[PDB]
Each structure stands twice: as C-alpha cells, then as structure tokens.
C-alpha cells in the first residue's frame, strides 16, 4: 500500500500546479501490483445509467478527458486514468512502461474497481490498451468509443515504421527536453490556436520529472508488434460489440485508411468524421465532443 | 452488328503482333450492347471443376493472366475479359469508360455467357468492377481472389487524391524495371490506339466517389463469400493499410503477403501464382 | 477575302446543324481577317453598352464556354466573344501556325477591325496570354482584366508545366487523332465530374471534330513559346495598374495558387475570388453563378468614368 | 537579466571548442534580449563601413551559413548575423514559443538594442518572412533586401507546402553537396534542445494569420531595392515562388543559379559574394 499512500501525499504535497478550476474532480489512488495509479471516479451516487472508462495516449493523461467528465457525470459514471509514468500517477523505476503491460494494469484496475458492462473510450494507445480487454472480456464490455487509434501490426507500413524509427533514434533528446509535449502535440492539432496556453501549461507540467514512458511509447509502435498481432488475430471477439468512431480527419498519424479498417470490422458501428480536427480529438473538439458521446451512451441502453 | 465482325477481323487481319508463344489462347469476341468485347475462354470440355472470371487493371489487359490461364485450363475453365478500350476489345466512341459503366458491361458479359458460381480474379480497377457483381449477385459467385485493389471511397485520402489530380494523358504502366522487355512491348502495342480508357480510370478514383460508396455501404453482401487475398507488399499504390481493411471485412479469408513483389502480382510473381489459386479452387469446390 | 468568309457562313448554316441553339441562342457572325475567317458573337444593347467585353477562351474550348456570361450580361454590356482560328466554328486554314503568339496578332487584327475601345478583357487559360499580348502594348484602350486560371510568364524551369507540355508533345499525334483533349484532358479539369454536363461535353466534342491542329500545338507552346511569354513578362509593368478581377478555381491542377499569388503581387488594383471546390474550367463548373462576380466588376469599374 | 546572460556569454567557453573557428574566424558577441539571450556576429571595419548588413538564416541552419559573406565583406561592410533562439549558440529558453511571429519581435528588439541603421537585409528560407516583417513596419530603416529561396504569403491552400508541414517528424534535419566538415558543423549545433526545428515546419500553416499580416501589406516593401538569388534545383521554393517576387518589387534584379539547390549560401559559397557586393554598391547610391 505504501506506494499508494505516497502518491496520495503527492496529490497534496506537490501537485498544486494543477488547475482545479477546469480539473475540479477528486484525485483518487489505488496500489495496483505494478505500482500506484492515479485515477478519477465521478458520477451519480447510484452509479448512473452507464459506466465509462477513458483511456489516453502519449504524452496525454486523464486531463485529456476533463470535457467529458464534467459534463457526463450528470447521468453517467466517468472513470479516468493516468498510466504509470504519466500525469500524477507513480513513476516507478522498475516498471516496463510497455503498452502490453499498461493493458495488464488496466485489467487489474478494472477488476479491483469491479467495473461492469463498461463502455471504453480509447484514444491513441488507449485503443489497443482498451481492446486488450474487450478482446477477452467482451461480455463485460458494453461498447467502444474509437478515436484516432488502431489494432493491427503496422511494421510493413513505412508510414508508421519511419515515424517509429525516427523517434526511437531521437528518444534520448525527447526525454531530456520533453519534445513530445513541446513538439509532437502541436503537430497533432489542426488548429494552432485551439491548443490553449492553459492546457499547454498543464500538459507540460504534468510531464515534468522523469518522462521515460513518453519515450517508450513510440518505440513500442514497432517493439510491441507481437502483442498487436495477438489483438488483430482475435478481432472477431470485438466485431459484435457496438462502437462509435469519432476521428480527426486532419490527423496525419491515423489516416482514413485506418478508419476503413475499423469500419470494416464492426458489424454495428457509427462514424463521425471530424474535418478540421487533428489527432487530439478530445482536446481540440473539447466540449463539442460531449453530445457525440451521449448519443452513444443512450443507444447502448435500449439493447 | 458489323462492328462485331470488324473486331473479329481485327484480331487476325491486324493484331498479328500478339505473342502466340506465351498467349496461345483462342481469341473470341462477343457483341455486348455497349460494344464488342474480346475475351479468353479456355478450359476442359467439361466446363471444368470451376469457372474463373479474371478482371484486369489499368492499363493491363487479359495478357496479364496468361500464366493462370495456361496452367489452370488443365482442369478449370478460365475466362478473362478485355475491357472496352483495352486489349483487343472495341474502343467505342460512345462509351463513358467510367468504372460504373464497365461494371454493367461486366454483368452483361456474365449473363450473356451464362457463367455460373464463378470465381472472380481481380487486380486494381478489376477489384471494384468485380466486387459490383458480388455485391448485387452474391448468389452466383463462388469466391474472390483479391490482388492489390480496394472497395471504398478515398476522396479524403491525400495519397489517392494526388494520383487522380496529377496532370496526365493516361496511366502508363511504370511509376530495375519489373517486367521483361517482351511483356512491356506486349502492353505498349496495346496502348497504341484510343488511349481514352487509361485516362478515365485515374480520374474516376475521385469522379466515382458515389459509386464506391454504393459498394462500401453494402459490403456485407460480400463479407460471407470466401476470399483469398494476395498482396504485393512492395506496392505503394495499395498499401498494407488497404490490406487490413480487407482482412477486417471477410469472415472466411486467407492472406498471402508476397514480399519482394510490387503492384502487378500476376506479372512479377507469374507462374508461381498458380499454386496459390489451385489451393483456393479446391477449397471452394468443397462448398459445392 | 469575301469568298473565305462566305465559305464559313455557308458552312455555319449548312453544316453547323449540331449547335444546341437553345443554350447558344446568340447570333453567329463572321469576320474575314487576313490569316482567316474567325467566328464571333456580338451581343448587347442596340446602342453600345455601358461597357464593352471581349472574352477569350482556352484549349480546346470556344465561345460556347462564355454562353453563361453573354446570356446574363448582354442586358447592359456589349458581350463580344470570339472563336480562335482552328477552334469552334472558325476557319481551319491549312497554312496558319496556330501558335499562341500568332493568335494574339489575329486578336489584335480582330479588335482593331471592330474598333473596340476601353475594352474589358476576359481571359481563360491561353486566352490570358493572348489577351495580355494586347493589353501590354495597348493599355490605355483597355479598361480592365478578368483573370481566370492563366499566367503570363515563361515556365520552362518549372517541372510541373514542363513534363505536361513534353508528354503532350509526344502523344500529340494520337490526341489530335482521337481527340483525347475533350475526351480526357477536359474532364480532369473539373472538381465535380457531373458538373461538366453531357450536353456541354457533347457540344465541345462535336465542335472539335475535323482538323484540330490547334488543340495539339497549344500544349507544345507552353514551352515552345518561351520567347513570346518572356516578352510579355519583361513588360508586365504596362499591365500592373490596369484593374483586375481574378476568379480562380482552387482545385485546378494546372494553374496552382502559386501562379495566383504572382498576379496578386503584380496588380496595383485587384481583387480575388477563391472558388474552392472548382477546377480549371471556371465558366463551365461555376456556370451562371459566375455572372454576379463579373457584374460586380463592371459596376465598380464604371465609377472611374 | 543582463548579468545572468553574462553566464550565457561565458557558457560558450565550455564546449564551443567544437566550432571550426578556422572557417568561422569571428569574435562571438551576445545580447541579453527580453525573450532570451542571442548570439550574433558583428564583424566589420571600425569606421562602420559602406553598409550595414543583417543576415537572417533558415531552419535548421544557423549563422555559420553566412560565414562566406562575413569573411569576404567585413573588410569594408559591417556584417551582422544572428542566431535565432533555439539555434546556434543562442539561448534555448523553455518558455519561448519558437513561433516565427515571435522571432520577428526578437529581431526587432535586437536591431533596436544595437541601433542598426538603413540596414540591408539578407534572408534565406524562414529568414525571409522574419526579415520581411521588419521591412513591413520599419522600411525607413531598411536599405535593401537580398532574397534567397523564400516566400511571403499564406500557403495553407498550396498542396506542396501542406504536405511538408503535415508530414510526421521530430524536426527538420537538413536533407548531398555539403562537405562532411560543413554538414557536421550544422549537425553539432543541431544537438541539444531542437524544439524550434520542429515548430517551423508546422508554423508554415499554423502562422497563416502572420503570413497574411505580411502579404496583405506587401506594398510597404515593393519600392525597397531588392536582389533575388534563386537556387533553381530547390524543390521547396520553386520558380513558381520566384515569379511572385519579380511581380512584387519595382527596383529589383533576379539571378537564377542553375545547378544550385536550397542552401544557396553553402552550395554557392564564396561565389555568392560578388552578387551581393554588386548590390551593396548599387544600393549605396540611394544615400
């Protein structure tokens, strides 16, 4: 537990850089076996009509989802997570920070909280990390929110390969200078004005200190190939789950050719094509995203 | 009507340049409403264990499939179609050469010959053209062979957008060359003529967004049909990104990833392709 | 010369049965210029209009391209529009060069034989250079410029125009045989393939049958006429203070916004209409929606005089 | 803050032994400007010379690029060349935007702290727009413009520039006609905080408003004497960009360098010096 308790201290002893005016939610912490994870649990006290778990990307953290948490806690249970190494979660010296292990921390999280019939919101790596539950616990999954992500090995697509290789080579400078927030995030947005300076301050401050996990994510694009293969080979386990697909059409990382792969998979899915929006859909579209979610959170409920 | 006789004459009065060592097939011509097509129909007298319809790309023609036809005609009936505008088919003044009109001529071809439970072999634009018949007549298709092609609207994809919007007359083959010089001439000799069809196809990638949507939005007509996907992994036109979309679609499918092979899988992999088909035909045959 | 004009006039009435006069109701008229008989329309008030317009077309287009302007601007303005030699219903003389630098001389001979004055020029495609090669040495007789997907400078160092010009240079003998210009080159100029109507497509295809030597020399001249195009560019200062309305199809693969920025730097007095979702053939693809963009200019020109 | 920048002044002497001072034989100088301390060349005669030249580099280049001009003109002309924040030996402050519109403000600050007078600007790549800004709003104090492979307009509808910005990268590395001796003298300073190298390719689109704020008021500049020197083999700044400058300026001269690519002051080297010095005398007759 002692790891959990020291993170609970840091939430008070150190984290006063947080802007609670936009991030008012309650910081909660649990000592999972891999380390102490920071998380948020907001909703009606009866648990709401449906429960949501929101899974993020590089170098993002739970602050990505604040627009959903503030607005859907009206009737739904928003649960939001920081992976180890990210946000205000623990930065353990001995964890792998591998995506194939974050997915095991995410399973351990879901099981210890005992979340049930859960709808998973997945951005970036949060997709694979979420699918690494819905592939093998599909009866405990109510539905999927799919945003700028993938579920297949890309090692023959020179698009993803050359980007992964480039960041693998440069990783030490990116971890030394935080070029992930300072450079890679700005190019994810389509509108240079929509990534606010207040957000920029928060994403930068949250990724200070050690940032090893931010560096391992782009390596894992290729380095985790076998785990991604193990997802894709069992894609059939997700094709009956309903999903809403919400996608930034100006994202150069995940093209419409990724969308067609998801749109081919699901036997029951709906697609929202956000033109003029890039990779960080929940940040760039913000409050405008919430009705696109709520429409799905009802459409699940009558089946 | 005489236009049918005119194309029949053109084969032997004029098209004496065809390499009848590697393309030994008996030439046949059929008078469809939109024009007289040239086609191959070679097989055993029985009608064979299967009937195969082979659809080419741009600017290829039925000479693309000579390796399959000569080796499968042992036991299977092989039919391969020159599109209007291409090969020794008529180059009609009247025709749009738009894919949605080729697809109708393809339905008209299949019905006028009465082919049954056919296996569709498709490359490049022969994909969407072939998938049309499998979208709307999935009762009469035995299976699909899916080489470097697609079945979705791409107008938001900068990669395909560039290729359509680029200034050209028409798609010449090449863009260390991957063909024998003999083959490259046997294509060059066919492009000498009314090149129109070779130029409409790259435009229609955007010009026919509606028609590609009219396939994509009813893809579940096809998803239960058995398909074998054979990919030139070195191609830049149809990436592995397009491959995963097919792997997601079909329930019963098998993927063969040909490393070192580029766009023109039937030319570059050649006579080594035949066993990959025989393996699939004798799998389809156990469903009837 | 009257025999050559009479041959064309007889061929209009006897052979141009193909013209859809429902959309082309204008009166066909003919001038026996020195190099050959051009075909033209001259439509407007029975007086000289509020302003006089001359509209110069591209390849393989002809004055039928300007039907939508004539139809809705002859209300107050003298709409003159012209078919080049080798194009539309004009004469196809066997000894003419069909060079763009020579079309600009025949346009000069045309203008001065009709005596047009304070002219406003509409230039599409090659019609730009052809008209700029009048405005650049008769600027005081020019009221203003309408600029649509065109240029006025040598491009021999730009790989974009070069390889297109060189590719057509090679294929020319086939494109002149089978008319791949209307059948293939024109369709890629549209951002909506449907907006090039089957009626217009038929009309252009019918108009450009027979000798089409001009259609295939035009793309060669993109490089072949570098000397003439240079002669314009070096004297651009004679156009720089004529007012210009620039209406540009942003989907055009031929003339990019990079070209457009060159005009915006040149003109001391200009304004730009950025037609997103419209390609090269602005007067086809934008149809009658073009007309207000013209009339807005003719009003605010006339404020000067 | 200036005295904390006296540490920045000293910080050179930790490592900059690596600089090839035999080809960069210049006295390093630095100013504690408000956005951050900048390193600059200011090499010239004690008499202040015939002209003052301000030389503004591109990305990921730095003031090493202009060493041929500085070396060969400083006998008679005051040569000033500046390292952008994030580049060369200039400070790499974490709080700075590294956006072009803000670099221009540091350049305006830099000029005013030195008090430079009727300056000729020399600009390559992003050093174009960054210089053109000061020529929009202080053209009294600009003596002339030297233009190499650059632009001054919003290109977010241009497919060519769009591709280059939207392509996934960390930052713009140079690329073979460099010496490895020169190539490494770039790559050396390209080590360390390289944030700015990755912002610039985005700002090609993300600063459309600032590029508009140049293009809309281009008429402030069209009467300034200009000489345009173009690397014709460059794929980034085509002849298509060149024509728009030949349209802009009245008093201007064009030099077209066939067989030269983007990095004109490298790939042409000391052979650039006569093309400039001709222009320096041509401008001097406007005093």
- CB contact under 8 Å between A235 and B244, yes or no, is no
Residues of chain C found within 8 Å of residue D215, distances taken between Cβ atoms: 264
Residue B73: Cβ within 10 Å count: 19
Structure tokens at B266: 């039937």
> Catalytic residue numbers of A?
124, 251, 279
Instruction: Note if D234 is an active site residue.
Output: yes
- How do strand D142-148 and strand D226-231 relate by DSSP bridges? parallel
Rounded Cα distance, B282 and B272, in Å: 17
Two tokens, residue D94: 């974490």
Contacts of A183 (CB under 8 A, 6+ apart): D170, D171, D195, D198, D199
Report the b/e string of B206-229 with b at 16+ CB within 10 A.
bbbbebbeebbeebeebbebbbbb
Query: Do residues A269 and A240 touch, judged by C-beta distance below 8 A?
Result: no
C184 within 8 A of B196, measured Cβ to Cβ: yes
Short-list C111, C114, C113, C156, CA closest to C137: C111
> What would the two tokens of residue A162 be?
């050359």
CB B125 within 8 A of CB B100: no
Query: Across the A/D interface, how many CB contacts are shorter than 8 Å?
Result: 46
Measured CA to CA in angstroms, residue C195 lies from A131, C277, C281 at distances of 45, 11, 10
Name the E strands within chain C: 29-32, 37-43, 52-56, 78-83, 119-124, 142-148, 244-249, 270-275
Give the Cα separation of A179 and D196 in Å (integer): 10
Residue D75 CA to residue D63 CA, distance in Å, equals: 18
Token couple for B153: 């609207």
Sorted by sequence, the CB contacts under 8 Å of residue A158 that are 6+ apart come out as: none
Tell me how far apart the alpha carbons of residues C271 and C247 are, in angstroms, rounded to a whole number: 9
Q: In sequence order, which residues have a C-beta less than 8 Å from that of residue D240 and are 6 or more positions away?
A: C158, C160, C256, C258, C259, C262
Q: Is B59 helix (H, G, I), strand (E, B) or coil?
A: coil
Q: Is D167 within 8 Å of A192 when comparing Cβ atoms?
A: no
Judging contact as 3 or more Cβ pairs under 8 Å, the answer for A and C is no
Q: Does the distance separating the beta carbons of D168 and A163 come in below 8 Å?
A: yes
Phi, psi of B82 (to 5 degrees): -85, 120
Whether D138 contacts D194, CB under 8 Å: no
> What superfamily does domain D4-285 belong to in CATH?
Alpha/Beta hydrolase fold, catalytic domain (3.40.50.1820)
| CA gyration radius, chain C | 18
From CA C207, how far away is CA B214, in angstroms rounded?
A: 35
Beta bridge partners of A273: A247
Verify whether the Cβ–Cβ distance B207 to C187 is below 8 Å.
yes
| Coil/strand/helix, residue B131 | helix
| Residue among A296, A279, A247, A295 nearest A119 (CA) | A296
Q: Cα–Cα distance between A200 and A189 in angstroms, integer?
A: 12
Q: Are the beta carbons of C158 and D244 separated by less than 8 Å?
A: no
Q: Given CB atoms, is D240 within the 8 Å cutoff of chain C? A: yes
Q: Are C61 and C55 a contacting pair, CB within 8 Å?
A: no
Question: Do A175 and A153 form a contact (C-beta atoms < 8 A)?
Answer: no
- Residue D100: other Cβ atoms inside 10 A: 22
β-pair partners for B54: B80, B121
B184: contact with A, CB 8 A cutoff = no
Angle between helices B196-207 and B158-165 (to 10 degrees): 140
Comparing C-alpha atoms, which of C275, C297, C282 is closest to residue C68?
C282
Helix axes C257-266, D239-248, angle to 10 degrees: 10
Of D159, D232, D248, the CB nearest to C265: D248
Task: Decide: A246 and A272 in contact? Cβ < 8 Å.
Answer: yes
What is the enclosing helix (H) or strand (E) of C176? helix C159-178
What residue spans of C93-126 are helical by DSSP H?
Answer: 100-114
Residues in chain B: 288
What are the structure tokens assigned to B94, written together?
A: 């009247």
The CA-based dihedral angle spanning residues D1, D2, D4, D7, taken in that order and rounded to the nearest 10 degrees: 160
Closest C-alpha to A209, from A91, A101, A297, A118: A91
Q: Which residue has the tokens 């070195």?
A: B234
Distance (Å, whole) CA A117 – CA A79: 13
Question: Are A191 and A282 a contacting pair, CB within 8 Å?
Answer: no
Say what the resolution is, in angstroms. Answer: 3.3
Q: Is C235 on the interface with D (CB under 8 A)?
A: no
Residues with Cβ within 8 Å of C70's Cβ and at least 6 positions away in sequence, in order, are C26, C41, C43, C55, C79, C81
What's the rounded Cα separation, in Å, for the pair D277 and D287?
A: 16
Q: Which residues contact B213 (CB under 8 A, 6 or more apart)?
A: B153
At A122, list the tokens.
Answer: 């997945």
- The span from the CA of C183 to the CA of B92, in Å, is 12
SS (H, E, C) chain D: CHHHHHHHHHHHHHHHHHCCCCCCCCCCEEEEECCEEEEEEEECCCCCCCCEEEEECCCCCCHHHHHHHHHHHCCCCEEEEECCCCCCCCCCCCCCCCCHHHHHHHHHHHHHHHCCCCEEEEEECCHHHHHHHHHHHCHHHEEEEEEECCCCCCCCCCHHHHHHHHCCCCCCCCCCCCCHHHHHHHHHHHCCCCHHHHHHHHHHHHCHHHHHHHHCCHHHCCCCCEEEEEECCCCCCCHHHHHHHHHHCCCEEEEEECCCCCCHHHHCHHHHHHHHHHHHHHHHCCC
Q: Which two structure tokens, joined as six digits, stand for C41?
A: 């329309």
List, in order, residues 6 or more apart from B180 with CB less than 8 Å away.
none
Active site residue D262: yes
CA distance B184 to chain A (A): 29
Q: Per residue in A251-264, is it b (16+ CB within 10 Å) or e — as a string?
A: bbbbbbbbbbbbbb
Per CB-CB distance under 8 Å, the chain D contacts of A166 are 168-170
Query: Measured between CB atoms, does A273 come within 8 Å of chain B?
Result: yes
Method for this entry: X-ray
Q: Taking the alpha carbons of C249, C252, C257, C261 in that order, is the dihedral positive or negative?
A: negative
The whole-angstrom separation of Cα B78 and Cα B75 is 9
Q: Active-site residue among C280, C289, C304, C305?
A: C280
Q: Return the structure tokens found at A23.
A: 């991030």
> C-chain residues within 8 Å CB-CB of B196?
178, 180, 183-184
Evaluated on CA atoms B125, A252, A261, A153, the torsion sign reads: positive
Instruction: Identify whether the C-beta of residue C18 lies closer than 8 Å to the C-beta of residue C105.
Output: no
Phi, psi (degrees; rounded to nearest 5) at C26: -65, 155
**What are the structure tokens assigned to B19, written together?**
């390499």
A12-26: b or e for each residue (b if 16 or more CB lie within 10 Å)? eeebeebeeeeeebe
Q: Least CA distance to C156: which residue of chain D? A: D239
For A250, how many CA atoms within 13 A lie in the half-sphere containing its CB?
21
User: Residue B155 gets which letter from DSSP?
Assistant: T
**Contact in structure between C204 and C180 (CB atoms under 8 Å):** no
Which is nearest to B246 in space by CA: B266, B216, B267, B268? B216
**Residue closest to B27 by CA, chosen among B13, B12, B17:** B12
With CA atoms as reference, report the closest residue to C163 among C118, C107, C222.
Answer: C222
Bond prior to B59 in cis (omega within 30° of 0): yes
Distance CA D108, CA D117 (A): 12
Q: The domain at C28-304 falls in which architecture? A: 3-Layer(aba) Sandwich (3.40)
Q: Is the peptide bond before A227 cis (omega within 30 degrees of 0)?
A: no
Chain D residue with minimal CA distance to A181?
D195
Q: What is the DSSP letter of C287?
A: G
> Which positions in chain A touch B154 (Cβ < 8 Å)?
256
Is C184 in CB contact (< 8 Å) with chain B? Answer: yes
Alpha-carbon distance C36 to nearest alpha carbon in chain B (angstroms):
31
Helix pair D208-215, D127-137: axis angle to 10 deg:
50
With CB atoms and an 8 Å threshold, state whether B257 touches A152.
no
Contact (CB, 8 A) for A118 and A240: no
Q: Mutate one of D165, D168, D202, D206 to test the A interface: name it (highest A CB count within 10 A).
A: D168
CATH for B4-287 is 3.40.50.1820
Pick from A212, A203, A179: nearest CA to A61: A203
Does the distance separating the beta carbons of D170 and A174 come in below 8 Å?
yes
Type and span of the H or E element at B283? helix B274-284
CB B119 within 8 A of CB B284: yes
Token pair listed for D164 = 């280059």
Backbone torsions φ then ψ of C283, nearest 5 degrees:
-70, -20
Rounded Cα distance between D78 and D213, Å, is 30
Q: How far apart are the first and last CA of chain A?
A: 40
- Say how far apart CA A148 and CA A277 lie, in whole Å: 11
- For residues A163 and A248, the answer to whether their CB atoms sit within 8 Å is no
SS3 A170: helix
Rounded CA-CA distance B277/A194 in Å is 53
Q: Structure tokens of B143?
A: 């299976």
Q: What are phi and psi of B79, to 5 degrees?
A: -120, 130
Separation CA B151–CA B245 (nearest Å): 9
**Ranges assigned E (strand) in A26-162:** 28-32, 35-42, 51-55, 77-81, 118-123, 141-147
Both tokens of residue B146?
């899916």
C158, C264, C274 member nearest D240 (Cβ): C158
Is there a contact between A90 and A1 (Cβ–Cβ < 8 Å)?
no
Q: Is C122 helix (H, G, I), strand (E, B) or coil?
A: strand
**Gyration radius from chain B CA atoms:** 18
Side by side, the strands of the sheet bearing C244-249 are C29-32, C37-43, C78-83, C52-56, C119-124, C142-148, C244-249, C270-275
Q: Which of B26, B12, B128 is nearest to B77 (CA)?
A: B26
Distance, in Å, from the CA atom of D252 to the CA atom of D146, rounded to the nearest integer, reads 10
- Token reading at D7: 């540490």
CB-neighbour burial class of residue B46 (10 A; exposed 0-12, middle 13-18, buried 19+): exposed
Bond into C29 cis (ω within 30): no
Any CB–CB contact under 8 A between C198 and chain D? no
**Shortest CA distance from D207: residue in chain A:** A192
Q: What φ, ψ does residue A130 adopt, rounded to 5°?
A: -75, -45
In angstroms, what CA-CA distances link C17 with C3, C21, C66? 21, 9, 20
For residues A48 and A115, the answer to whether their CB atoms sit within 8 Å is no
> Catalytic: which of D72, D75, D262, D284?
D262
DSSP lists the bridge partners of residue B218 as: none
Who's near B125: CB < 8 A, 6+ residues apart? Answer: B57, B58, B99, B102, B149, B201
Q: Name the DSSP letter for residue C86.
A: T
- Rounded distance between C-alpha atoms, residue D285 and residue D281, angstroms: 7
Compute the distance between CA of residue C201 and CA of residue A103 in angstroms, rounded to an integer: 59
Nearest CA to A215 out of A97, A73, A131, A124 is that of: A97
Q: Calculate ∠ Cα D198-D200-D202, nearest 5°.
A: 80
The pair of structure tokens assigned to A168 is 């693998």
């Amino acid at each position: 537990s002692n790891a959990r308790d020291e993170v609970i201290a840091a939430i008070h002893e150190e984290a006063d850089w947080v802007d609670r005016t936009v991030y008012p939610f309650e910081s909660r912490c649990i000592g999972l076996s891999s380390g102490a994870v920071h998380y948020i649990d907001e909703g009606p006290d009866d648990g709401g009509r449906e429960t949501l778990l929101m899974l993020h990307g590089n170098p993002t953290w739970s602050f990505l989802y604040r627009h959903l948490v503030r607005d859907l806690r009206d009737e739904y249970r928003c649960v939001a997570l920081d992976y180890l190494g990210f946000g205000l979660s623990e930065r353990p010296t001995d964890f792998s920070y591998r995506p194939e292990d974050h997915a095991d921390v995410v399973e351990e999280f879901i099981d210890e909280l005992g979340l049930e019939d859960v709808v998973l919101v997945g951005h970036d790596w949060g997709g694979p990390i979420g699918f690494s539950y819905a592939i093998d616990h599909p009866e405990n999954v109510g539905g999927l929110v799919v945003m700028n992500t993938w579920m297949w090995p890309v090692s023959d697509d020179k698009h993803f390969s050359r980007f992964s290789k480039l960041l693998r080579i440069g990783r030490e400078l990116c971890e030394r200078y935080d070029l992930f927030t300072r450079v890679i995030m700005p190019m994810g947005f389509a509108d240079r004005s929509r990534f606010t300076e207040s957000a920029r301050e928060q994403y930068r401050a949250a990724n200070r200190g050690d940032r090893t996990g931010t560096g391992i994510f782009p390596q894992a694009i290729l380095g985790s190939r076998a785990w991604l293969s193990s997802l894709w080979e069992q894609r059939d386990n997700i094709a009956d789950i309903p999903a809403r697909i919400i996608w930034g059409m100006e994202d150069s990382a995940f093209r419409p050719a990724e969308l067609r792969t998801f749109e081919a998979l699901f036997e029951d899915s709906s697609t929202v094509r956000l033109y003029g929006v890039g990779h960080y859909v929940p940040e760039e579209f913000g409050s405008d995203l919430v009705p696109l979610v709520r429409e799905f959170l009802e459409e699940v409920h009558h089946h």
